[PDB]
Amino acid sequence: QALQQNGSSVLSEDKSKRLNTILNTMSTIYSTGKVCNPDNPQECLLLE
Amino acid sequence: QALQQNGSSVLSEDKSKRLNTILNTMSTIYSTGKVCNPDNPQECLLLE
Ligand SMILES: *[C@@H]1O[C@H](CO)[C@@H](O[C@@H]2O[C@H](CO)[C@@H](O)[C@H](O)[C@H]2NC(C)=O)[C@H](O)[C@H]1NC(C)=O
């Protein structure tokens, strides 16, 4: 049973590629998104 | 005549520091300004 689950295999190739791309985009936006001061737009901070 | 030049010494002290702050802010804005497109806001380019 632990070896039986299909996972993402049953998903179509184009749909699988789309899902992987969307997950990577999500992770990249979360990791490298920054906001900026309203009175000094040349000073912008990451999250962590 | 070259040596007798007065320069900005004739200006008031508070106005002198105000002018120096303005010049420094101008230089910093020009040097560190950056822009980026709405397609991928996580890639912003300097000028040079
Ligand atoms: C994982 O996906 C494959 C699909 O290829 C499943 O295989 C099917 O199994 C059913 C049930 O016996 C058959 O009716 C189909 O003919 C099979 N399709 C094939 C071989 O292409 C497999 O069962 C899935 N694993 C699960 C649900 O645990």
From Swiss-Prot, chains A, B:
It is found in: Cell membrane; Cytoplasm; Cell projection, Cilium; Apical cell membrane. An engeneered stable, dimeric and secreted receptor with combined mutations that increase the affinity for human coronavirus SARS-CoV-2 spike protein shows potent SARS-CoV and SARS-CoV-2 neutralization in vitro. It comes from the Eukaryota. Expressed in endothelial cells from small and large arteries, and in arterial smooth muscle cells (at protein level). Expressed in enterocytes of the small intestine, Leydig cells and Sertoli cells (at protein level). Expressed in the renal proximal tubule and the small intestine (at protein level). Expressed in heart, kidney, testis, and gastrointestinal system (at protein level). In lung, expressed at low levels in some alveolar type 2 cells, the expression seems to be individual-specific (at protein level). Expressed in nasal epithelial cells (at protein level). Induction: Up-regulated in failing heart. Expression is induced by IFNA and IFNG. Exposure to cigarette smoke increases expression in lungs. Expression is decreased in nasal and bronchial epithelium of individuals with allergy after allergen challenge. IL13 stimulation decreases expression in nasal and bronchial epithelium. Changing E13P: No effect on interaction with SARS-CoV spike glycoprotein. Glycans are attached at N6. Disulfide bonds join C36-C44. Proteolytic cleavage by ADAM17 generates a secreted form. Also cleaved by serine proteases: TMPRSS2, TMPRSS11D and HPN/TMPRSS1. Essential counter-regulatory carboxypeptidase of the renin-angiotensin hormone system that is a critical regulator of blood volume, systemic vascular resistance, and thus cardiovascular homeostasis. Converts angiotensin I to angiotensin 1-9, a nine-amino acid peptide with anti-hypertrophic effects in cardiomyocytes, and angiotensin II to angiotensin 1-7, which then acts as a beneficial vasodilator and anti-proliferation agent, counterbalancing the actions of the vasoconstrictor angiotensin II. Homodimer. Interacts with the catalytically active form of TMPRSS2. Interacts with SLC6A19; this interaction is essential for expression and function of SLC6A19 in intestine. Interacts with ITGA5:ITGB1. Interacts (via PDZ-binding motif) with NHERF1 (via PDZ domains); the interaction may enhance ACE2 membrane residence. Belongs to the peptidase M2 family. The extracellular region of the ACE2 enzyme is composed of two domains. The first is a zinc metallopeptidase domain (residues 19-611). The second domain is located at the C-terminus (residues 612-740) and is 48% identical to human collectrin. This is Angiotensin-converting enzyme 2. It comes from Homo sapiens (Human).
